[PDB]
């Protein structure tokens with residue numbers, strides 16, 4: 219027995235966890251065996267290993283009505299709230315009060331996070347992934363390519379065009395100026411012509427503009443930005459396979475000495491300098507401040523969230539609600555944050571000076587440390603309290619200089635934190651928003667690739683947003699916002 223045991227009798231719980239369109243809970247994960255060893259709760263993965271769409275899997279699972287004991291994963295918040303209210307998950311408030319001292323104490327100290335995750339009925343239907351940190355993504359450019367071509371790091375959008383055009387036309391390596399492992403980043407490019415693409419680290423999020431709730435993709439600023447993005451795409455400044463390359467884009471495009479420029483996270487993006495040192499002679503990425511946009515400002519639209527829309531819930535089928543909440547509580551305690559952030563003691567880390575310290579092999583490894591942790595069951599989107607010291611330990615000094623530059627320059631835009639809708643308001647949001655958003659993404663794709671001309675289609679686009687309920691959503695969001703702020 220361990221001090222962390224939540225039951226004396228071993229308990230197997232069925233988990234449906236399908237995430238990032240690729241992965242399921244793997245009971246072979248060292249971290250999962252370590253979770254079992256420390257908690258005496260074993261998880262049994264029932265999600266389809268072959269499926270390549272996480273959100274449809276959750277939906278089909280719900281549809282089938284063959285529910286497991288626990289459901290977890292990414293971008294589940296809205297569904298945890300909707301299906302919890304409908305009786306598929308149980309509320310957690312009273313379970314937490316009585317049996318989850320760590321989650322309890324976390325919510326009491328973070329009342330804005332509690333508030334962000336509650337359903338209109340005041341119920342907590344899930345335990346969230348809680349990030350730790352300040353900045354998220356930044357702009358990175360090939361300084362070795364800047365040198366080769368004798369070009370200054372670009373200071374504004376006119377200069378960025380000129381630099382990227384030069385990566386294209388002058389063969390600094392087949393050269394592909396902009397690449398990204400997140401296709402949504404292509405739309406974030408509208409930032410350079412003074413348009414938002416999001417109000418938060420969640421892509422295609424709402425924002426507030428002088429106390430008006432707006433969607434960035436509805437705005438004519440977005441229209442004009444997108445006409446430039448399509449042009450850049452037409453010119454091959456953007457990876458032709460931007461929408462399909464995905465997760466391994468950096469391994470492929472930087473490793474193969476093809477990619478010049480990206481917008482990604484500081485810790486992992488900057489490890490490629492050490493990692494690709496043997497295979498690509500003199501590969502050097504530098505963090506750059508966001509080149510000034512057409513409106514005369516330097517925008518970093520992205521920031522680390524106080525709570526992400528990911529985590530896990532307890533289904534109606536769970537015959538062991540009490541053991542389960544105690545199992546969730548583990549990941550909000552020191553030893554649970556240890557394994558879920560650091561991996562396995564004696565394998566990927568050891569306790570030194572009262573804290574988890576990654577081993578030398580983990581730190582010197584060419585793979586980003588978070589990628590190493592994914593492969594073993596850690597830094598995955600269950601309900602857990604992230605510890606930024608895990609990240610600090612593999613943040614290079616060069617990555618840290620870049621962050622400090624972002625912090626000093628005040629480039630990071632304030633994030634949208636959500637609104638607190640009533641039952642009726644949130645019902646409209648739930649009825650429409652998913653659909654609206656998928657249409658927006660499909661339209662944006664069409665504009666970027668040149669399938670549709672932004673100007674000839676902007677009006678039918680507005681028409682569509684209207685009959686797809688977007689403006690009805692915004693009005694309900696505006697009502698909730700005004701109740702709270704104005």
Ligand SMILES: O=C(O)C1=C[C@H](O)[C@H](O)[C@H](O[C@H]2[C@H](O)[C@H](O)[C@H](O[C@H]3[C@H](O)[C@H](O)[C@H](O)O[C@@H]3C(=O)O)O[C@@H]2C(=O)O)O1
Nearest residue numbers: 238292293349399400465483484485486487586588597609
């Ligand atoms: O890459 C880093 O340096 C880094 C440091 C932090 O400790 C986190 O690990 C941060 O994690 C990101 C990770 O970079 C990816 O962005 C992943 O992205 C998923 C998003 O959360 C969305 O769900 C998206 O639709 O899919 C993304 C994907 O899987 O690529 O999420 C984590 C995160 O924020 O936890 O990276």
